[PDB]
Amino acid sequence: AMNSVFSGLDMLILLPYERRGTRLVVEDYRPDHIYCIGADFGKNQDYSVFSVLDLDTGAIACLERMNGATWSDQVARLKALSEDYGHAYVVADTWGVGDAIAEELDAQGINYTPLPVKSSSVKEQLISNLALLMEKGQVAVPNDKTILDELRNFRYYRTASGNQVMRAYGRGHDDIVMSLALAYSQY
Ligand SMILES: [Ca+2]
């Protein structure tokens, strides 16, 4: 596609995994490594995606995805992932998530840093970083067709005034794309 964002998809490293319910587990926790978790919440009927990145290797160790999970359940699942990966810190897109998730992150003692995806400018910085790392052969994800498809279908458009926009082709989703970009913002 002429308007592909991820022109370096050919350099994406593809990793085998075990599906454990809502998790795709590439590898279990290694305590000599430091991890973070990109978190795109399930604000309403959209998916929540939590991407555990090994910051020593640049590889996704685990990716959890679901939709329709309660807000509290999303936070509990994030807590469990964080704890599983050595109190991995969460890079949380807190923009427009609502008071309950924001309060729950603090109330539950989640190890997190806010990265609100609050404009097209912020989004472009996150995505361009992911795209560059990808072309450089530094991005490694679970070899799952849904993940690869969501990256393949992430495209450039232009607004009425001529500003750049990045979004899913057609009527698609970008929760996986954004979760991965949030994780890799730290790499
Ligand atoms: Ca979402």
CATH assignment of the domain containing 130: 3.30.420.240
Distance 46 CA to ligand 1 centre (A): 5
Distance 176 CA to ligand 1 centre (A): 8
Distance 157 CA to ligand 1 centre (A): 20
Amino acid letter at 114? P
Within 8 A by CB and 6+ apart from 97, the residues are 41, 43
Tell me how crowded residue 99 is: count the other CB atoms within 10 A of its CB: 7
Experimental method: X-ray
Domain total of the chain: 1
Q: Is 158 helix (H, G, I), strand (E, B) or coil?
A: strand
Torsion angle (degrees, nearest 10) of CA 157, 176, 99, 187: -100
Domain span at residue 109? 1-187
> Using CA atoms, how far apart are residues 62 and 81, in angstroms rounded to an integer?
9
Instruction: Name the residues around ion ligand 1, CB cutoff 5 A.
Output: 40, 46, 175
Distance 68 CA to ligand 1 centre (A): 10
Distance 92 CA to ligand 1 centre (A): 11
Distance 32 CA to ligand 1 centre (A): 31
- 57, exposed or middle or buried, with CB in 10 Å at 0-12, 13-18, 19+? middle
Taking alpha carbons only, the member of 181, 149, 177, 175 closest to residue 40 is 175
Distance 7 CA to ligand 1 centre (A): 24
Distance 110 CA to ligand 1 centre (A): 19
DSSP 34: -
> Using CA atoms, how far apart are residues 7 and 9, in angstroms rounded to an integer?
6
Distance 38 CA to ligand 1 centre (A): 12
Q: What is the resolution of this structure in A?
A: 1.1
- 26, exposed or middle or buried, with CB in 10 Å at 0-12, 13-18, 19+? buried
> Using CA atoms, how far apart are residues 150 and 160, in angstroms rounded to an integer?
25
